[PDB]
């Protein structure tokens, strides 16, 4: 078994080497008011991780638009990183624009509790907000490439719940009960739950299930763009 | 921080009370050569969790077809569980077939490292994916306020099943990957002659010694996977809010 940071806790304060330079976390991003997704890997020159980088690369401006920086992590040198970035541009055509924390020894992997033993593990994703608090954590195994578009869905939807003070429901914007409807936090008191029904200002299925549709059309369609893209069988392969 | 199990550990041997009775973990599901997915929940009669149950239900056949059982967990009584299921049958119109582990106080949940509190049970939102040798293969910790994408869980188990069955790894976004589309990856070589021999066979399409692949997944396999994602993607025709004054 093993220890890790927890959702809702503030990202582990740390100073790190990336192949764009030394920076601090979560500070580098908090200062700028940007969110970041942090995503980890066992070693460079791994094919699954290669496809993941290429997939993150393609959706780079997508993340920028949201107010969301990317940062990878593997337990090799910065030199290993650079050579691998070169290999991908040269052999695949795609330039990787995001930084990559370099963590030989696995000190950062260990610090963050991706390492506990074998490196071997370590396909973790952290989504940190701009108060620098952890919001979501995915652990996909090494043998299973991530679905990068769902990552986009999760940040978009978190941002949107934060801004409007709404919870968000299974599969949103295509939820089968309420569609692109967001959910109103349940009422902690009984005089709140009561006056929430007789108000008639939300659409309720009971005191504790009320929702509206305050998300604009462009937040909704962006979110669906993300999924359709995931669903789409791709036009041209990049191998040929 | 908190302690949790690890990908590639055995699921903790334990016995849980559910609304379907006592069931034993992971043995019960290992006993039938069955994968299982376990998803946790802070309390009964909560909105997001309700929409995840419904979602999960509506996909039960997809799961049953894959060889994958479902089991939920929330910190409330078997009374509430069952009462919450009646509510969803009476108000949404959907019968939740699967069991829900009863765990008020929340010991079963602490035992899994799904809460690290205190009293405040806001945190209890994980999904374990456990295979048929009873071993954890994947774990997702969404937050309370953000419902999951169930078609993505379907994708994972599909991908994992195929990987093991074909001895392949699975690319980013599979079956709709940018570089290799539906292709699956050949486990990178360990030694020097392994790298040379493989190029001197052309049995795989290959960018460099450590990036070879083939397309071994049968159309069937690939089409159902794609169907998971389309379903995800499509704006729904009928909403169950409306098809429910009936």
Q: Which of A2, A54, A153 sits opposite B179 (nearest CB)?
A: A54
Q: Are residues A135 and A162 in the same domain?
A: no
- Assign B167 to helix, strand or coil: coil
For chain B, what is the domain count? 2
Helix/strand/coil (H/E/C) assignment for every residue in B42-99: CCCCCHHHHHHHHHHHHCHHHHHHHCEEEEEEECCCHHHHHHHHHHHHHHCCCCCCCC
Q: Are residues A155 and A122 in the same domain?
A: no
Q: Which of A121, A232, A238 sits opposite B6 (nearest CB)?
A: A121
Q: Which of B148, B211, B239 sits opposite A170 (nearest CB)?
A: B148
Chain B residues touching A207 at Cβ < 8 A = none
- Return all residues near B18 (Cβ < 8 A) that are at least 6 apart: B71, B78, B81, B99, B100, B101, B102
Q: Are residues B63 and B182 in the same domain?
A: no
What resolution in angstroms, rounded to 1 decimal? 2.5
Q: Are residues B88 and B188 in the same domain?
A: no
Interface test with A, best of B145, B155, B164, B231 (most A CBs within 10 A): B145
How far are the Cα atoms of A48, A113, B160 from residue B170, in angstroms, in the given order? 7, 25, 8
- Assign A140 to helix, strand or coil: coil
Give the tokens for residue A222: 């962006």
How far are the Cα atoms of A119, A178, A183, B189, B207 from residue A205, in angstroms, in the given order? 48, 11, 11, 57, 55
- Give yes or no for a cis peptide into B12 (omega within 30° of 0): no
| Annotated catalytic residue within A16, A49, A73, A96 | A49
Q: Are residues A132 and A149 in the same domain?
A: no
Q: Are residues B63 and B155 in the same domain?
A: no
Give A13→chain B minimum CA distance, Å.
Answer: 13
Q: Are residues B130 and B86 in the same domain?
A: yes
Final residue belonging to a domain, choices B145, B163, B192: B145
Which of B109, B139, B107 minimizes the C-alpha distance to B6? Answer: B139
Give B243→chain A minimum CA distance, Å.
Answer: 9
Provide the phi-psi class of A105: left if phi over 0, else alpha when psi is between -120 and 50, else beta.
left
Give A27→chain B minimum CA distance, Å.
Answer: 19
Final residue belonging to a domain, choices A143, A165, A181: A143
Q: Is A145 in contact with B229 (Cβ distance < 8 A)?
A: no
Nearest CA in chain B to A138: B140
Q: Are residues A215 and A131 in the same domain?
A: no
C-beta separation of A157 from A135 below 8 A:
no
Q: Which domain holds residue A118?
A: 1-143
CATH number at residue A208: 3.30.1020.10
Q: Is A208 in contact with B149 (Cβ distance < 8 A)?
A: no
Q: Is A91 in contact with B149 (Cβ distance < 8 A)?
A: no
Q: Are residues A136 and A232 in the same domain?
A: no
C-beta separation of B190 from B166 below 8 A:
no
Q: Are residues A5 and A122 in the same domain?
A: yes
Q: Are residues A82 and A160 in the same domain?
A: no
C-beta separation of A156 from A223 below 8 A:
yes
CATH number at residue A117: 3.40.30.10
Between CA B159 and CA A131 the distance in angstroms is 35
Q: Are residues A167 and A127 in the same domain?
A: no
How many helices (H) and strands (E) are present in chain A, helices listed first?
8, 11
């Amino acid at each position: 078994p093993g220890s890790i940071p927890l959702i809702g806790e503030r990202f582990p304060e740390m100073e790190v080497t990336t192949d764009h330079g030394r920076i601090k976390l979560p500070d580098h991003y908090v200062s700028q008011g940007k969110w970041f997704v942090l995503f980890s890997h066992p070693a460079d020159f791994t094919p699954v991780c290669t496809t993941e980088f290429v997939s993150f690369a393609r959706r780079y401006e997508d993340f920028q638009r949201l107010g969301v920086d990317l940062i990878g992590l593997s337990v090799d040198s910065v030199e290993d990183h650079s050579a691998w970035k070169e290999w991908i541009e040269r052999h695949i055509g795609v330039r990787i624009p995001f930084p990559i924390i370099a963590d030989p020894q696995g000190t950062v992997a260990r610090r963050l509790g991706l390492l506990h033993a074998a490196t071997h593990t370590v396909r973790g994703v952290f989504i940190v907000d701009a108060r620098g608090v952890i919001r979501t954590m995915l652990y996909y195994p090494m043998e299973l490439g991530r679905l990068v578009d769902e990552i986009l869905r999760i940040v978009k939807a978190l941002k949107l719940g934060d801004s409007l003070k709404r919870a968000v429901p299974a599969d949103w914007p295509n939820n089968e009960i309420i569609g692109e409807g967001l959910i109103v936090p349940p009422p902690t008191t009984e005089d709140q739950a009561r006056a929430r029904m007789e108000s008639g200002q939300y659409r309720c299925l009971d005191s504790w299930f009320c929702w509206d549709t305050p998300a604009s059309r462009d937040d909704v369609e962006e979110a669906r763009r993300y999924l359709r893209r995931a669903a789409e069988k791709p036009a041209k392969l990049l191998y040929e």
